[PDB]
Amino acid sequence: REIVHIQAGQCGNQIGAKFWEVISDEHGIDPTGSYHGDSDLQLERINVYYNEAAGNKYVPRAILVDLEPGTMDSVRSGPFGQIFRPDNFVFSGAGNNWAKGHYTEGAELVDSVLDVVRKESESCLQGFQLTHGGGTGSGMGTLLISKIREERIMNTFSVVPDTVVEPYNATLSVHQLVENTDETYCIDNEALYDICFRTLKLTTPTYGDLNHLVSATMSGVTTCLRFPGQLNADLRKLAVNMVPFPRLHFFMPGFAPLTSRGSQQYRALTVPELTQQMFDAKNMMAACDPRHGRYLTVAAVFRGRMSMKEVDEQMLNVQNKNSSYFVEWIPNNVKTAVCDIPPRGLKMSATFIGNSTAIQELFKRISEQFTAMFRRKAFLHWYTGEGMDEMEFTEAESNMNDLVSEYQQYQ
Amino acid sequence: RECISIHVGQAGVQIGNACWELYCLEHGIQPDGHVPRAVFVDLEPTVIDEVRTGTYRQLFHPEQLITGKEDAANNYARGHYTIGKEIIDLVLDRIRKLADQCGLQGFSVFHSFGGGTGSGFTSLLMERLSVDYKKSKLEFSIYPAPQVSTAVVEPYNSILTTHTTLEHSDCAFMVDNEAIYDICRRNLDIERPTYTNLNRLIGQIVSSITASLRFDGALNVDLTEFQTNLVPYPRGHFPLATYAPVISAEKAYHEQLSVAEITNACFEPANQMVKCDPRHGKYMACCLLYRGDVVPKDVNAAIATIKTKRTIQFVDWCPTGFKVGINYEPPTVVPGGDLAKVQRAVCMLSNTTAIAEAWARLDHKFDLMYAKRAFVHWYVGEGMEEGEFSEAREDMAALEKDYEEVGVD
Ligand SMILES: Nc1nc2c(ncn2[C@@H]2O[C@H](COP(=O)(O)OP(=O)(O)OP(=O)(O)O)[C@@H](O)[C@H]2O)c(=O)[nH]1
Ligand SMILES: Nc1nc2c(ncn2[C@@H]2O[C@H](COP(=O)(O)OP(=O)(O)OP(=O)(O)O)[C@@H](O)[C@H]2O)c(=O)[nH]1
Ligand SMILES: [Mg+2]
Numbered sequence A: 001r002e003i004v005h006i007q008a009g010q011c012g013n014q015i016g017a018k019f020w021e022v023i024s025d026e027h028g029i030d031p032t033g034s035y036h037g038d039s040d041l042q043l044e045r046i047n048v049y050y051n052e053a054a055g056n057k058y059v060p061r062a063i064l065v066d067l068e069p070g071t072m073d074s075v076r077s078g079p080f081g082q083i084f085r086p087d088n089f090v091f092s093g094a095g096n097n098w099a100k101g102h103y104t105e106g107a108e109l110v111d112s113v114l115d116v117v118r119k120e121s122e123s124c125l126q127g128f129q130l131t132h133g134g135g136t137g138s139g140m141g142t143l144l145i146s147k148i149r150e151e152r153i154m155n156t157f158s159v160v161p162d163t164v165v166e167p168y169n170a171t172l173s174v175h176q177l178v179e180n181t182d183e184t185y186c187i188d189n190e191a192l193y194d195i196c197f198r199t200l201k202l203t204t205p206t207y208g209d210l211n212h213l214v215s216a217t218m219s220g221v222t223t224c225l226r227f228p229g230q231l232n233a234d235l236r237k238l239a240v241n242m243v244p245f246p247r248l249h250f251f252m253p254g255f256a257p258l259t260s261r262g263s264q265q266y267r268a269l270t271v272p273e274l275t276q277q278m279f280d281a282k283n284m285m286a287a288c289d290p291r292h293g294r295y296l297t298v299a300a301v302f303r304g305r306m307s308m309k310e311v312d313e314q315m316l317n318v319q320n321k322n323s324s325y326f327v328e329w330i331p332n333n334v335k336t337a338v339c340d341i342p343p344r345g346l347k348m349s350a351t352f353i354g355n356s357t358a359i360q361e362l363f364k365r366i367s368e369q370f371t372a373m374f375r376r377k378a379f380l381h382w383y384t385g386e387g388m389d390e391m392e393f394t395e396a397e398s399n400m401n402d403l404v405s406e407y408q409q410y411q
Numbered sequence B: 001r002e003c004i005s006i007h008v009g010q011a012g013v014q015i016g017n018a019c020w021e022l023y024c025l026e027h028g029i030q031p032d033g034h035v036p037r038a039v040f041v042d043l044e045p046t047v048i049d050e051v052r053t054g055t056y057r058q059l060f061h062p063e064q065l066i067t068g069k070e071d072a073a074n075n076y077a078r079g080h081y082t083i084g085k086e087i088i089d090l091v092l093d094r095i096r097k098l099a100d101q102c103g104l105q106g107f108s109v110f111h112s113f114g115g116g117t118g119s120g121f122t123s124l125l126m127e128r129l130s131v132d133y134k135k136s137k138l139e140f141s142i143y144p145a146p147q148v149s150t151a152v153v154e155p156y157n158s159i160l161t162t163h164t165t166l167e168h169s170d171c172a173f174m175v176d177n178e179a180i181y182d183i184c185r186r187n188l189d190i191e192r193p194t195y196t197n198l199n200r201l202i203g204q205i206v207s208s209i210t211a212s213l214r215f216d217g218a219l220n221v222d223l224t225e226f227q228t229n230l231v232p233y234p235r236g237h238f239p240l241a242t243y244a245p246v247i248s249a250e251k252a253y254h255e256q257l258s259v260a261e262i263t264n265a266c267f268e269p270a271n272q273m274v275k276c277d278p279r280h281g282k283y284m285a286c287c288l289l290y291r292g293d294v295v296p297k298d299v300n301a302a303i304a305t306i307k308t309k310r311t312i313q314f315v316d317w318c319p320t321g322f323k324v325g326i327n328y329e330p331p332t333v334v335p336g337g338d339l340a341k342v343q344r345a346v347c348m349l350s351n352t353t354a355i356a357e358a359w360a361r362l363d364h365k366f367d368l369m370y371a372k373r374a375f376v377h378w379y380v381g382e383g384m385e386e387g388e389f390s391e392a393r394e395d396m397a398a399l400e401k402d403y404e405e406v407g408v409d
């Protein structure tokens, strides 16, 4: 099987450097070097992220998309920066109109994209990893998938938060994520800072970091499950256990051992310590706080030798101490997953992929903000004036809003 | 006469290397002797490689060591239909290539019940067998257990494997599910029982089946013998495996336990590699395979005492259902694992009314999932239909009635 990473924007890019910084070592691939792999198993499945050309040069099969040179020119001028084949670096009026990047402006640039998304797929393809309330985002990216899904999965690692029409560009994209995408690990820039400045006494959290933290979660998700386990799952399981209603629904990823370097290295990681972590408010890469709305599904994708008993068990008390918020029409919201090998240097970790709520309590939010401002067409002229439609916004909000109703169908 | 074996999954392979070890060990065939009679499958090279790098390296043919190159998927459908299909041919080929070289009796499969490549795949493997050879499909699994399942879907994968297994899987030795752990907690003491420790066990009980039995003795028991003395009815009936001297090689020392103790310690409700406690299940046939220093009178007495304990109630239509299998060579414990190492053991297996449970509890799971179609779209879109499910459910239904009628009455 295979996948092709996608470093959209600076952030998504900055993180690329960290996602690949890691992953490589978790696959013994030095800058341009080959497989120094301490073992022999970190190679039989690499393909998922590289390509064979020379014989020591397995090049990451990702894409680096960005309209700001300096960025990619910082990622390409630093450490592992010289492993990406230059071909990878893909450096109109990008109006902040969902309809401007989905129907009028983006619709053109699409074919010249699909072109490549095929050059990379035909590099069997599984899906693409994507790291990164606007035009080029909700509209054009929400199109990229609607096309992809007609032609493999689409995991999205978003750094959820800053705009005015926001609910317009949003409601319209969530809509598409219902019949297109189907896997988002909603990470974030200020939910990260927090989680990175108080859960990691880290005082100067550079972007590289945030990115790095995020990339840490998207590794636990995918790649991870493509490892053995007493009880392993894979994108689908994750999908087929987490989406009660077709909207596509968005999640909120959370990593396990998130302790400051020296001191904190408490090792309180028997397991109750990981669920302690993962399930608290802070520590949810999302902005919103779980404590503010039930869950529909949860997927503790652990990856480190543990007792299918102390795992399967804990999950329960957790489900009972908080019966309040965990929705009821799902006897067992939680989807326990269990890999074996842990994050290279750690003893025990567990990625958390939480699905927000059925009284969709986030898409609700978003959807609300829209209407309250759509009603007055607030900053709508910046969309329409960019070749959009008054029916486009209607569409999204309606399509995205419906997701909340369906998701409740299971709560 | 023979019984091929397909060890699937890293685990099924680790357990395989183990069960395969115990074998030669009690047949005097060192590292490099004859030729096995099984195969090894895995989609992760590094593990089968362990059989290619480590011990028992040259006792295999790089031909009976396969890997793969696709996705597992913890979903029946995909494993049975869609993906699993592609491999089957090839799979069969070996159980037709290995079945020829030997009039065989079946394939002892080593992997697990509920799962992606364990439920689905086999479903059609046993499926394609019942038509070809009509033979036996006894799959030796390391699974659950009810309240401690793993996969989120598990039941979907079980209810589907049962229905399509009715004519596919004859008997699934459902050990390691969670009842073998008890044995590791209660009869050996250890909270850290790695999957490797659980296999060493079946790796033992199994050694008592083939290995030693196909090995000369004072009361030999052929494979056919089993099914004959062990299945009262065509349903690929599933007996349960049990071992006697499961004492710890460090804790206690109650080793010297006369045959008049090891036998009885196979009746208790906490030493049978199966969470099917005789909650009522009347035995209907037991094959007491002994090994080591055992006097036939000791047995033809230790068993007599049992036949009259009544609280051990055997089926009605069955006067005597005790196949006494005596071997010579005592067991052979891992040099330094955690198994005691006695000079006699009792690997008694049997059809109790009792899987009446295990099947029940596994069937109900399907109804819960299917009742909502859960992961159904995953199979349909893989060349299956509302038929195969619903019609494989009805299948097992008459396996809940079968295992009920042949007993309790
Ligand atoms: N972790 C991380 N987050 C970043 C980084 N750069 C930006 N962000 C976050 O991503 C969002 C910023 O997106 P922008 O840089 O404004 O825009 P863009 O997505 O690159 O595309 P344009 O709006 O067209 O410029 C904010 O929420 C930032 O906090 C980065 O290097 N790392
Ligand atoms: N008893 C026993 N269980 C094992 C052994 N090795 C692995 N297992 C168990 O079997 C499962 C592991 O399967 P993997 O090793 O990940 O995979 P595989 O089935 O060999 O095939 P791939 O996923 O393609 O590598 C886990 O539930 C382990 O606990 C073993 O030697 N003995
Ligand atoms: Mg930009």
Ligand SMILES: [Mg+2]
Binding pocket: B009, B010, B042, B043, B044, B045, B046, B047, B048
């Ligand atoms: Mg393997």
